[PDB]
């Protein structure tokens, strides 16, 4: 059982990647809502967990954490400062070239769970919600990524939409 992300145009099979990290923004009950960050390229460049590929929202082929997920922020109390999320196990996404890329559902849910755990240990014992992007430009509203000099765009909704206690 898997999650099928649309991607326009069709990413070749050879661009199949490993997801290693994320960037998130914190929105303005014990419910804190996070979105895939729609900030400029500066935040991504300065997360330094981005790694190798030129991607938005997700980081591919990048460096993994040592043991557990580690999250970083330049000010947890300033909503305007992004949170860089670094995983320990990568999430393989295999593109078929039919215009969509596949992710394991169980795998992504466990990833989200661990991220939420680390987020709780930062903001407190609240409810971690993940919602889709906030809009802005088509650049950062979608999971963008560069492969072999081509900049593909994928939809992130199915990844960024769950609730955890």
């Amino acid at each position, epitope marked *: 059982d898997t999650i099928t992300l649309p991607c326009r145009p069709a990413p070749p099979p050879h661009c199949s990647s490993n997801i290693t990290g994320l960037i998130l923004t914190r929105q303005g009950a014990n419910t804190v809502i996070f979105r895939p960050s729609g900030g400029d390229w500066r935040d991504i460049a300065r997360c330094q967990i981005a790694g190798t590929v030129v991607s938005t929202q997700l980081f591919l082929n990048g460096s993994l954490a040592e043991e557990e997920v*580690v999250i970083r922020s*330049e000010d*947890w*109390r*300033d909503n305007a*400062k992004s949170i860089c999320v670094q995983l320990a196990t990568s999430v393989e996404i295999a593109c078929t070239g039919a215009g969509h890329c596949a992710i394991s559902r169980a795998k992504w849910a466990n990833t989200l769970k661990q991220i939420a755990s680390k987020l709780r240990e930062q*903001y*407190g014992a609240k409810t971690i919600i993940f919602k889709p992007s906030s809009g802005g430009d088509p650049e950062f509203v979608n999971h963008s990524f560069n492969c072999g000099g081509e900049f593909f765009y994928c939809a992130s909704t199915q990844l960024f939409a769950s609730t955890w206690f």
Partner: antibody
Amino acid sequence: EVQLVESGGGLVQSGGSLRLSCAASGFTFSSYNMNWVRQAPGKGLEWVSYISYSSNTIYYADSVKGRFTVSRDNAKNSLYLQMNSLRDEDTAVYYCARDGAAALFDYWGQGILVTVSS
Amino acid sequence: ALTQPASVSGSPGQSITISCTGTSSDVGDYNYVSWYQQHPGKAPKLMIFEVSNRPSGVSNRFSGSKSGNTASLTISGLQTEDEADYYCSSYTSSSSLVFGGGTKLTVLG
């Protein structure tokens, strides 16, 4: 176990330069943000400065602004506060605090005394 | 910005509450509210964070609450070890960490 041990302090003259040091151990120093606080003998706590993990977000207090300068070195797991043009009003015990996000400050260093007198 | 009572007293076994008052800035903007204990010549120790939460290891006699413009730290079954200074801390409207005026708890013996 989390441990913050501070170095520096002592007598300084009105207008001198002192650099306080804080060594951290027992946690990824490179992950947490940090803070400097100070307390005048027989007065309360006053947040001095804040330094990000990336050292790109630095914040100062209106008083020390222009005269104090925070820094850090992740290679040595160390935080530093440079105090220049010291006034007698800056005589205090300086503490090394770790940012706890919603907890504000969570771990403190033992504290070191700085006495500015001429 | 945060005002506390200078001094509070109570007997062994009794309970006492320490206030921390403000307005639209600190306790009236976000739930970032912490209480630190300080013994003579030692460093502050986090006793309560996020209004009510208690770091593991701290006795369940310490509790915290907030009522808009007034944070409150309650201590039940006073003992000698409680005798110390206490500070509230918060995050201001304009991203500024602010401490309380400090309050001395004396265990009346």
